[PDB]
Design a protein around this ligand. Structure first.
Ligand SMILES: *C/C=C(/C)CC/C=C(\C)CC/C=C(\C)CCC=C(C)C
Lengths: 5, 147
């Protein structure tokens, strides 16, 4: 899980 | 070994790359710069609504004159010099003198953990290490603007 994409 | 690394890198070419919203299918971003080239701080503007996607399909098309046993990337996402995330992607075997398309699905964190655009823009660096197995072939960096 990405927080920036 | 630094010699091999150099012949791998000298033989390598990121041809194009896309980011696409995996729900609508639309391409939100594409470049054709060899954002893979070390020694330079590349930049990229992405539309800030990318941050609202549930998942993004990244598509990378690359050529390599040299074979690689296990081509893979490690990507660190830095915010004002502080590592927030670490991503690992494995392509695997690369046939000498090939051109390949590599697709990877990057899924969003729950909304309550997504970082706002206004906080991110200009402050994010993606540092990519290009490996063949355990041989570090190069290290490239991209500064991101979320526009
Ligand atoms: C998924 C959404 C975001 C904002 C990530 C954007 C990342 C970009 C524009 C840079 C991508 C850098 C890559 C894929 C490394 C290229 C380097 C090699 C292939 C060695």
């Amino acid at each position: 899980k990405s927080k920036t994409c | 070994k630094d010699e091999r690394a150099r012949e791998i890198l000298r033989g390598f070419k990121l041809n194009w790359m896309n980011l696409r919203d995996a729900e609508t299918g639309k391409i939100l971003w594409q470049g054709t710069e060899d954002l893979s080239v070390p020694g330079v701080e590349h930049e990229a503007r992405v539309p800030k609504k990318i941050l609202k996607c549930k998942a993004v399909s990244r598509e990378l098309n690359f050529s390599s004159t040299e074979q690689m046993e296990k081509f893979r990337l490690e990507q660190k996402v830095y915010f004002k010099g502080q590592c927030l995330e670490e991503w690992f992607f494995e392509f695997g075997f690369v046939i000498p003198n090939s051109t390949n398309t590599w697709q990877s699905l990057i899924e969003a964190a729950p909304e309550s953990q997504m970082m706002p655009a206004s906080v991110l823009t200009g402050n994010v660096i993606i540092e990519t290490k290009f490996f063949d197995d355990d041989l570090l072939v190069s290290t490239s960096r991209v500064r991101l603007f979320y526009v």
